[PDB]
């Protein structure tokens, strides 16, 4: 037991949320949120969620917080609850995620329509006049 590494990861996550929850100098708040997102991604990756952790680290960090900082720039215990068996010759996470195209037709339809409406709504809101 590496002194319950997940415990330290969770504590650092909470410390980061406390750090930018005071909201000092919103770029410093954003950087604290970047560190917190990195810590949470590390938590998910260490748990075993490689694909979902990489989704966090790519989408969240590289797109959403990047756009946040861009707009701001324009302005002024463990190891016990786990399993025993194996997964086969694949990862169950990848199979469940890829099931979105064979099982989740309804989810794909609603999410795609929502994203298209989001694009249209953004255009209308940012039209100005």
């Amino acid at each position: 037991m590496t002194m319950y590494i997940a415990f330290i990861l969770s504590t650092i996550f909470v410390i980061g949320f406390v750090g930018f929850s005071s909201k000092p100098s919103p770029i410093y708040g954003g950087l604290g949120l970047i560190v917190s997102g990195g810590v949470g991604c590390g938590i998910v990756l260490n748990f075993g969620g490689s694909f979902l952790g990489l989704m966090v680290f790519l989408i969240y960090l590289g797109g959403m917080l990047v756009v946040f900082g861009y707009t701001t720039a324009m302005a002024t215990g463990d190891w016990v609850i786990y399993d025993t068996g194996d997964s086969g010759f694949f990862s169950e996470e990848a199979m469940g995620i890829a099931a979105l195209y064979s099982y989740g037709t309804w989810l794909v339809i609603v999410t795609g329509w929502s994203l298209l409406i989001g694009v249209v709504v953004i255009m209308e809101i940012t039209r100005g006049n």
Partner: protein, 98 residues
């Protein structure tokens, strides 16, 4: 219920409280919302992976997508508010009073 889930929920509560404080900078409001969705993603992912709910692996991605879309909308709104005042201060939105 292990301590990690409690830590994540405490993080979410801290983010929500910080959103409710409103020192200034509505951008910080959006930041608090995004911290809240990040905590939601992390804890939902941990719960789903742990119980081996294979079809539930869909849900976090969906959540992320939708939440990020919301952020975009919020950012747009912020710009227009700033586009009227030049700054994103909360107290500038005092025109409407109960």
């Amino acid at each position: 219920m292990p301590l990690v889930y409690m830590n994540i929920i405490m993080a979410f509560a801290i983010a929500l409280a910080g959103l409710l404080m409103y020192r200034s900078h509505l951008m910080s409001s959006l930041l608090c919302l995004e911290g809240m969705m990040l905590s939601l993603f992390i804890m939902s992912t941990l719960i789903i992976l742990n119980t081996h709910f294979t079809l539930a692996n869909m849900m976090p991605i969906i959540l992320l997508v939708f939440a990020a879309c919301e952020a975009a909308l919020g950012l747009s709104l912020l710009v227009m508010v700033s586009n009227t005042y030049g700054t994103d201060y909360v107290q500038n939105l005092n025109l409407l009073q109960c």
